[PDB]
Amino acid sequence: DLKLPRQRVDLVAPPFVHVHEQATKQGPKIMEFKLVVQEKKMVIDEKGTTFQAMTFNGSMPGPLMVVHEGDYVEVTLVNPATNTMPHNIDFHSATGALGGGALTLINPGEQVVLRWKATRTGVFVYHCAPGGPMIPWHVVSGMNGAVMVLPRDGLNDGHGHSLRYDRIYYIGEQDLYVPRDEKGNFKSYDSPGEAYSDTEEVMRKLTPTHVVFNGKAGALTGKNALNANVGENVLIVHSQANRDSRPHLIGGHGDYVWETGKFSNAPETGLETWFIRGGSAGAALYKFLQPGIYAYVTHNLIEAANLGATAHFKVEGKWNDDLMTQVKAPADIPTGSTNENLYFQ
Amino acid sequence: DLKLPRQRVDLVAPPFVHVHEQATKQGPKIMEFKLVVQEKKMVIDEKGTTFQAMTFNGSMPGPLMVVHEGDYVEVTLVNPATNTMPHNIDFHSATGALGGGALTLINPGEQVVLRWKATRTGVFVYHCAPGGPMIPWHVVSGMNGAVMVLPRDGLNDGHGHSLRYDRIYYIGEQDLYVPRDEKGNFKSYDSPGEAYSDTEEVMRKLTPTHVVFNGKAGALTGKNALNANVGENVLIVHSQANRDSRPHLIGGHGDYVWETGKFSNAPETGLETWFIRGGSAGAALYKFLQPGIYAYVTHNLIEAANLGATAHFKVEGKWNDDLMTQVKAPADIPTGSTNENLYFQ
Amino acid sequence: DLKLPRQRVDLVAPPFVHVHEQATKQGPKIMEFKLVVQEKKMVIDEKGTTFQAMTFNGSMPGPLMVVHEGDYVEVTLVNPATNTMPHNIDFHSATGALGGGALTLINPGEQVVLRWKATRTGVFVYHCAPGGPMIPWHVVSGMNGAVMVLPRDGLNDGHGHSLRYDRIYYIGEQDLYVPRDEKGNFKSYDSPGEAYSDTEEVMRKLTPTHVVFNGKAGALTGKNALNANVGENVLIVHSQANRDSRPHLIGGHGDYVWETGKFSNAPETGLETWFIRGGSAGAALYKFLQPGIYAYVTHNLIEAANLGATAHFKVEGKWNDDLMTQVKAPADIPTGSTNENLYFQ
């Protein structure tokens, strides 16, 4: 008796995002999505450490879903019989039944269909939440993604001006809790159930062993750097389902930032570093002004450099010497400025 | 020579709140409160772990005090002779003398009377702060609560519209640092002074053993779930005197959120998760739209599920299938969608 | 071919700030600064613990630089041949080349000259970032400071009213990771290179051993308390290059707070406690209303009291009994209020 047109969406693997309109003249639709749970061993760092991951659609994070305010979102959640555990889904975008968790619990060999109305604009976390201690364990094993609910007129600056992005990337940040043996080496297991007891002990001390973007250390560096061009406005959606993060674009800014992630609120302008509260998604727009490599980090630099939480942008274009220039390349310290140099000595 | 009418307030135990007006036509009053310090052993988790608590009025958190802008707050602080330590009180709502700490130090067998003018609107932490290392130790032993200073016209949305709550709950979140023996079992002591040295060692590593609402794991679940009804606007005041928190209402939202807690600032709209900075109180309004169980957590889900930080709301009313429905209950995965399902495989 | 007037600035050691105008009728200038790297052993706590620090200009934090929107900032970075490591500088205020890091790498015996345009208003972190794991290690060894880019019309309240400070202080907060031996005693080293391996192990567990203002526990207490007078509007700039903080002025407030630190955004009013995201600077204005000692802390009170993170203000002036008074000094609890006292018993 919901009498609206239906539109299948084909999801794509992060950090990319399925095709969508920003501003739309379409009316409300039933937007149809499918998520398939996959339990699998995955490589999470550059030394080849593995862990028993649980995922939506085989990725950490799960894929970004994009709809408009007033759409209905009809999600088929599938739990293949090759899986070992029950799973469900909780949309922070949705109203009632623990975000849908209380209507989507499925055993291996089952699927369920949930519909929720997109009444709240912004970027939102979705995650598995089967009950009790299994809630944090499924989330920190990788069962979390995000959904974006755009206003039908697209983004604005909170002051009556339209904002349009040229490109969008979804950065899902994952805190991982990998057990170690007595010598400090990471431990391997043959199933998620076998890893559980040792993993819960690490989780209880609230200190991750790894903090990664797109599921592994180095996943968005080198060959898999994020592309952009000088002049492009880029939307960077950042989610963290369990733990705080402080995003920073090294050599850039957040031109417009919704750090609490909700487009009914005006964005902040010109941030250096923003804050994604654990259990949320946020978003930053930036118009690139300079070519070159840009690191995108959480600005706990220990987590960024030593636990896995660095992505790169490779930006093509021409250098602007008015914004920044090397006036003098590295040279020998004269003599002759010794007394000057002071001085604190 | 302060020539105003006096009004006694009788405090009640959290999560409930003493009777008060939102909007008032009363002028400034001297609002009279009494807090009695109680040192006592308390049960803090579902396994019956005890710890040597220090409290205002026998509860963690201490009770919520409610006054209006321009009121004077006259607090009698009592330290019974059955107590073993000195105590005092610091109101983050108050101006001068370290929030009142420097005027309220009392030994067992003494009481003191402090008056502060409510010049700043919002929700604010109060806590004990006797000096030096005793400041964190008294606070993380449970000596903290909150005070709400309402505007005389009540709450508003920052855009000229009145906001009224039907119900108010005060959620005090407490980080606890319980010593363990060599086998990992929690240790018991005969007095707070005996527990101190071992507790300070845990405190120094900044990782709590427990994170609890209303003083213990499970304190606001089951029989003591928070009641509401569909259509009610509920104000949820959240305080944390020592450590950050990220509140989330599972299956709901924050319709209007003052996460820094101060009603001179417009609230944010439609949040999924908000952020209570350690040493502050914040507040969220929500109008319930769906019946059923709602979990209220800090969205570090490890802390929520495994260290004690989950409350429940039980909401009566009729389900709205337009907002959310189970389109198809759990069923067998057909065959026939195998190739479809993809695909990431 | 940049055809503007040049103005040398002489930096001063924090928490003080070089002379500058708030509002200015000067046009854009090339503002010339010099920073000299100094590696040196420094005392970081009241027990005389030492560590192998790395600094800009011999201080933690490095000094505050102040310029106006549209100025060009020309920084000579010097790495004396007595140093052992390469260094560079990344301005979060600057656009391109990793904030300048990619144009300023210098070996001992070298200097480099970088120019960046001050296109973004606010307070911003600067820090060393030589590459890879050396980025967090140089930052948490003390190589970080801040730059303030004022609007040419000075500060405003976001609602068309000018804000002017009488005094400015720069509080740089530093998380330190000092290795311990098997007995728990802090370890000493003859060089930063010798300290590195043991320090990286502490860094990896994300729990600092010390959290200090102006480079050491007690650095802004006693003789070095910050001075003010009743009626003065004081700007308190707070930076943290690697880790979150939650500033609080005990017995005061933040009258106007830019916790994300960027003056294109209206400040929040009347905060109790604010939040400096790791990798950022923020700023709070406060007009002192009461004389006496004020503690300024991070409101993790364990970090404030037990790990080093307390500063003091000593404020001269006359006490205002309307704002706060001790109605009755500590006295014997009567008898006769026993039944009253209740009650929770």
Ligand SMILES: OC[C@H]1O[C@@](CO)(O[C@H]2O[C@H](CO)[C@@H](O)[C@H](O)[C@H]2O)[C@@H](O)[C@@H]1O
């Ligand atoms: O009381 C609401 C509670 O029930 C759930 C089932 O988990 O949703 C249902 O609500 C009613 C059952 O008592 C029915 O009217 C409805 O058919 C059903 O979806 C939860 O969503 C909610 O928490």
Ligand SMILES: OC[C@H]1O[C@@](CO)(O[C@H]2O[C@H](CO)[C@@H](O)[C@H](O)[C@H]2O)[C@@H](O)[C@@H]1O
């Ligand atoms: O971190 C403890 C200790 O363990 C060792 C191996 O015994 O390294 C492990 O931990 C390192 C830090 O996480 C990893 O780099 C490595 O993959 C892992 O085996 C030691 O090298 C280290 O001292």
Ligand SMILES: OC[C@H]1O[C@@](CO)(O[C@H]2O[C@H](CO)[C@@H](O)[C@H](O)[C@H]2O)[C@@H](O)[C@@H]1O
């Ligand atoms: O200098 C203010 C300082 O004193 C206190 C006492 O702890 O308040 C007092 O201030 C004056 C004492 O020098 C008196 O005028 C007043 O009677 C008294 O309350 C503190 O509140 C403050 O930090």
Ligand SMILES: OC[C@H]1O[C@@](CO)(O[C@H]2O[C@H](CO)[C@@H](O)[C@H](O)[C@H]2O)[C@@H](O)[C@@H]1O
């Ligand atoms: O956590 C360490 C280790 O200690 C034991 C008892 O030896 O359990 C203790 O710690 C648990 C986690 O906090 C608690 O659930 C329990 O109350 C406590 O005794 C072991 O069971 C555990 O492996």
Ligand SMILES: OC[C@H]1O[C@@](CO)(O[C@H]2O[C@H](CO)[C@@H](O)[C@H](O)[C@H]2O)[C@@H](O)[C@@H]1O
């Ligand atoms: O592609 C930009 C990249 O180069 C740097 C050098 O580290 O800046 C340079 O940019 C160009 C070199 O390809 C030149 O036009 C320019 O002379 C030079 O400064 C970085 O700043 C940037 O990341």
Ligand SMILES: OC[C@H]1O[C@@](CO)(O[C@H]2O[C@H](CO)[C@@H](O)[C@H](O)[C@H]2O)[C@@H](O)[C@@H]1O
């Ligand atoms: O904290 C561990 C343990 O080590 C000792 C010395 O063995 O103290 C060290 O650690 C203390 C806390 O950081 C410091 O106060 C002191 O400078 C340091 O030597 C013990 O006293 C303590 O139990």
Ligand SMILES: O=N[O-]
């Ligand atoms: O400038 N960021 O590390």
Ligand SMILES: O=N[O-]
């Ligand atoms: O949806 N919260 O765990």
Ligand SMILES: O=N[O-]
């Ligand atoms: O009131 N601050 O600890």
Ligand SMILES: [Cu+2]
């Ligand atoms: Cu799951």
Ligand SMILES: [Cu+2]
């Ligand atoms: Cu959630």
Ligand SMILES: [Cu+2]
């Ligand atoms: Cu006390």
Ligand SMILES: [Cu+2]
């Ligand atoms: Cu306080």
Ligand SMILES: [Cu+2]
């Ligand atoms: Cu360096």
Ligand SMILES: [Cu+2]
């Ligand atoms: Cu940086």
